């Protein structure tokens, strides 16, 4: 029932609704698999890099802020509990 409790929320999602839905599952799967925050960042990047190729940069934490240059239609910013999974691909 923990997957129903976390209920991951997506403030800013400059991405297609299909690719967004995939991130929610990976985001939930990442946290319940991982023992620390450093491991969460590593699992997300590696999983997306395999699915969609290129140069991802993943950041997650309690309190931060983020001005970045990204491949247009490859940027999502979702917060779950107190963890903001921020992933973005660059050229």
């Amino acid at each position: 029932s923990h997957l129903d409790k976390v209920q991951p929320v997506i403030k800013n999602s400059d991405m297609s609704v299909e690719m967004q839905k995939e991130v929610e599952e990976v985001a939930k799967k990442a946290i319940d698999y991982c023992n620390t925050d450093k491991e969460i960042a590593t699992f997300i990047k590696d999983d997306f890099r395999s699915r969609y190729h290129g140069t991802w940069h993943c950041i997650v934490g309690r309190n931060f802020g983020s001005f970045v240059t990204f491949e247009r239609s490859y940027y999502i910013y979702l917060y779950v509990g107190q963890l903001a999974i921020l992933l973005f691909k660059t050229g």
Partner: protein, 52 residues
């Protein structure tokens, strides 16, 4: 009349110069440009590690 024509074309009434232009020799070369290697870095920052 044929000989007279050949007799009309002289050495001092029809000089015969040679002229060419200086042409550089063609040459086929390869150049592969590969950008700097890009290394993954993983850093975590907590309030204590900053203060420490």
């Amino acid at each position: 009349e044929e000989a007279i024509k050949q007799t009309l074309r002289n050495k001092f009434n029809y000089n015969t110069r040679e002229c060419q232009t200086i042409n550089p020799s063609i040459r086929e070369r390869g150049v592969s440009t590969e950008p700097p290697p890009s290394d993954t870095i993983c850093g975590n920052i907590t309030q204590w590690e900053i203060f420490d």
